[PDB]
Paper text:
Histone proteins package eukaryotic DNA into chromatin, yielding a structural hierarchy, in which nucleosomes comprise the basic repeating units. Each nucleosome consists of a core region, composed of ~146 bp wrapped around a histone octamer, which comprises two copies each of four different core histone proteins.
We generated two distinct classes of binuclears with either rigid 1,2-diphenylethylenediamide linkers, yielding three stereochemically distinct species (RR, SS, RS), or flexible methylene or polyethylene glycol amide linkers. For all of the chlorido agents, substantial adduct formation is observed first at the RU1 site, entailing bifunctional coordination of the ruthenium cation by the E61 and E64 side chains of H2A. For the three agents with flexible linkers—C2, C10 and PEG—little additional electron density is observed beyond that corresponding to the two [name] groups. It is therefore likely that the majority of adducts in the crystal structures for C2, C10, PEG, RR and SS are bridging RU1-RU2 cross-links, and the lack of clarity in the connecting electron density a consequence of linker flexibility. Nonetheless in the solution state, where nucleosomal interactions are dynamic, even the shortest binuclear agents, RR and C2, are effective at cross-linking nucleosomes. In the NCP crystals, we observe adduct formation at just one of the two symmetry-related acidic patches, as the other is effectively blocked by a crystal contact involving the H4 N-terminal tail.
Residue numbers in the entry:
A (entry chain F): 16 to 102
B (entry chain B): 21 to 102
C (entry chain D), D (entry chain H): 28 to 122
E (entry chain A), F (entry chain E): 38 to 134
G (entry chain C), H (entry chain G): 14 to 119
Write the structure that this text describes.
Amino acid sequence: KRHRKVLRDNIQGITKPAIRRLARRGGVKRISGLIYEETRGVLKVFLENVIRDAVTYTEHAKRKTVTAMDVVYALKRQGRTLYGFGG
Amino acid sequence: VLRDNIQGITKPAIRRLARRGGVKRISGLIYEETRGVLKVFLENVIRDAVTYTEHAKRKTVTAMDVVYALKRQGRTLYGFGG
Amino acid sequence: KTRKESYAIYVYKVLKQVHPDTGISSKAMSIMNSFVNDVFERIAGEASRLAHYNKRSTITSREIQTAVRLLLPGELAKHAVSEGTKAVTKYTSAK
Amino acid sequence: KTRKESYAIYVYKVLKQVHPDTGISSKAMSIMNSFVNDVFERIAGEASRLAHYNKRSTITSREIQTAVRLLLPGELAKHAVSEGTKAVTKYTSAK
Amino acid sequence: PHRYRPGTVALREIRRYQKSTELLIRKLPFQRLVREIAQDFKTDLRFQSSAVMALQEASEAYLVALFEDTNLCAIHAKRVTIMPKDIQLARRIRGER
Amino acid sequence: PHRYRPGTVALREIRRYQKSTELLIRKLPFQRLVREIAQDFKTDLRFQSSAVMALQEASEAYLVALFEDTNLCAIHAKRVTIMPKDIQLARRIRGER
Amino acid sequence: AKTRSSRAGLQFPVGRVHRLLRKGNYAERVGAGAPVYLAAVLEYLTAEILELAGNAARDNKKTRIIPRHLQLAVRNDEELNKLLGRVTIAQGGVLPNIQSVLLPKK
Amino acid sequence: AKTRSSRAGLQFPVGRVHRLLRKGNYAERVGAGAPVYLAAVLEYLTAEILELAGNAARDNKKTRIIPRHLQLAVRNDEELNKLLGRVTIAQGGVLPNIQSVLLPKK
DNA sequence: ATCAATATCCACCTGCAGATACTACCAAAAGTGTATTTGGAAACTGCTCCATCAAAAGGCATGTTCAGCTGAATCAGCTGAACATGCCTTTTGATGGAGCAGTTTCCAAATACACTTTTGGTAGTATCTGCAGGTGGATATTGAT
DNA sequence: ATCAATATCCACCTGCAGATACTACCAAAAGTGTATTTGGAAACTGCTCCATCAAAAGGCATGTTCAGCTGATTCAGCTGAACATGCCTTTTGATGGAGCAGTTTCCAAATACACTTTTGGTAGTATCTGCAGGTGGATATTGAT
Ligand SMILES: [Mg+2]
């Protein structure tokens, strides 16, 4: 491979409107303007936790690819069991 | 002086617990709410402990029965075995 | 081309039994498959622990039974226990 | 009559290295014992799962290590891991 | 002719009870309540002494902690007085409801 | 010239999004975010696309549920507007701290 | 020439369930009635969920159960909702539910 | 004869740990270092706690560690508290803590 | 109430995605049958330790009084919802190779079995001491004025 | 402010509950030497599917406008905190007996092994159909007035 794009600030792809939709699914009518940064933070923490575990499984298997099963097993450890992807 | 056993969990004992939990002022209706809550807690745990007892073909609930019930209800307790 | 097993065909049999003109999408089946694996693992685990707690080396239908009463809630437990008792009785008498 | 095992003495030996002039109540020791049994089960349990996910028949130190990483918070993990790799090194070299 | 202000003894008891670890429910009433409840699951039961003890430690830990969350819920609604709704909210959010 | 009153479109959306099941975060942005976070833990990693999808389904289900609890926290405070303090109270009671 | 499933009156696969108990290392030994009893419980639960999911499919004028219908089944049933209270059904959505104070007027 | 613990430089029973692993149905088989590693981890964690619980004894002018000292040790350390976050230490009480709004005015 | 702008609900249609189908085939199953191993129920029984209860301890049910908290009413300021508007970013569909995952050989490692050595739990009798619980008097805190 | 009621602090003393110490002991692990079984890295290579490139579908960013929500202020009234102690429930300690736990037995059921059969998966190429997403057309909801 030649070159490899730098990833930064991607947390900002979780847009104001996408966060409003999730609120809505969650039954929220009115949303303070500070909610959006707070939600980004909370999402970042959730992902760090689940990806860390998922990647740990990947490495323990000696792979370079994160499988759906790595994520499913990480989700199970963390008490957030997911059906629909192989477990 | 005929009286349900739940009521032996008295106002001043419920007040003491609250206090340990940092509570300053307490609505009067709390005492009945707290008894309801305690009853459900004990039901869920005792049900599971007894189920351990029945399994071991015993008539005595051991502390290990309780400790195992607490573990699977996500309330792991230390100091009574296991 | 490694063979990947699932409970799909059985889920489908049981589906035809209860809703004879109803289909199921593969994603819906995937979840049904997960659900069976999940409950299997959870019953089998309780049974595992239970055996150990009682210094038994063997998991019998009696261990499974308790694991069912520990794991499932009231009414589902009552009925699951019928159908498992029923099946073991009918299994023993069928030879 | 039946001998009732415990980690108590090993806990007590370690107390003395860590705090040679300090003692420990009966109840406190029982808690330290629960603690060791609990962490034992948690780590083994995670390790078992790891082996199974990876279709392996064996629980080696790599599984115990990965287990520790997954169970322990940050710094505790890191120091726990180094103490674990340490003891295995020393053990191999020793005849 | 001397009286303590509302909430002064309340604070005093918070400091006292936070500092200690005795159980705060009387043993006997709790013992009966345990047995009563166990009777609906199986009759003619006996309880090790340590079994009843373990149940008490657990319940009080549980209730104490539920009052912490409850108290946070009252404070959230700009109050200082715990109410059943605060206990309800805490239990709902804990996923007990 | 015409207008809905504030809250009318908001309820319209609640009914709409509660009726459907599509993911509500855009796919690619979410993907980058995954790859960024993973990269910080470990370089030269790839992802099965269903892995990313598993994360997205888990992430949105988590966040939607958090907003119900949050929304219950505002309502407890006699408000209808969720604020950061509501998210925080939800997460403390949930044991996420 | 008869399977243990047909011996027990079950659609679910007893041999398979026996096999999966052994290789999962739950205990040294696995009794003969265990995979029978377990396979039945599994069948009982999956039947219960399909019955209710099928109804949700029909209530939406559909013929093919999809995950939304499984979610409606589970979440509308107190006991299934509790059994699966820490599980997430991909593509299931949530139940319609708006809190009262949020609605218009008084 | 010389104990595997002494070989590994450990106060914690490598042998017992090994055995407890076999008769635990964790896997078909068990490598030679797994119990060594596991036992070190347990010793380590035990020490850390005794270190801090002893420190608590000291503060309260005591030489015998009681449950209260394990509780104060565990809940005043962010990491131990997280590990023991769904665990109740019998006879531990709670950390002195009063929400500031409940303090009287100056 | 009336009018009307806008959203919502049908119903009907049509391409095609993805679901049900089927015929060939097979490896890994599950089943069958006979040989050998043993786990745990079953039955007697010894000794904790659990229920019961009398006497000794002491915490709580009671009602009165009023501080100060909760919640209703009111209002200004300004946050956040709605919407119009310009277009950037994601989505969708079609082409190159890193790495996964499936086969096989081979020894480094774990199991097994039996043996021989020690350690760790218990009990026995006694051996020891940290500290909870009580005293006294100095000082802090709270509340009345 | 002062003044006094009461809570809180520190020091010192003391009896014993609960700790550490001990030796027999013996029994049961854990470790030591010999023979057996088995797992999984390394070496190799088919081939899935992940990363990475261009064209088409529509959601995002931004500024403007004002509805109505939040949070401050005030205040009446209701409701929970504080209070004194004789009174009744819990605690402490004394004593039979239920049952749990220790032990030995023996057999029904489980493990093991070896052909024998069945079946659940996939793969190749075909064949069917539920419904998503388009249209237009009839009815509901909302907000101005
Ligand atoms: Mg980075």
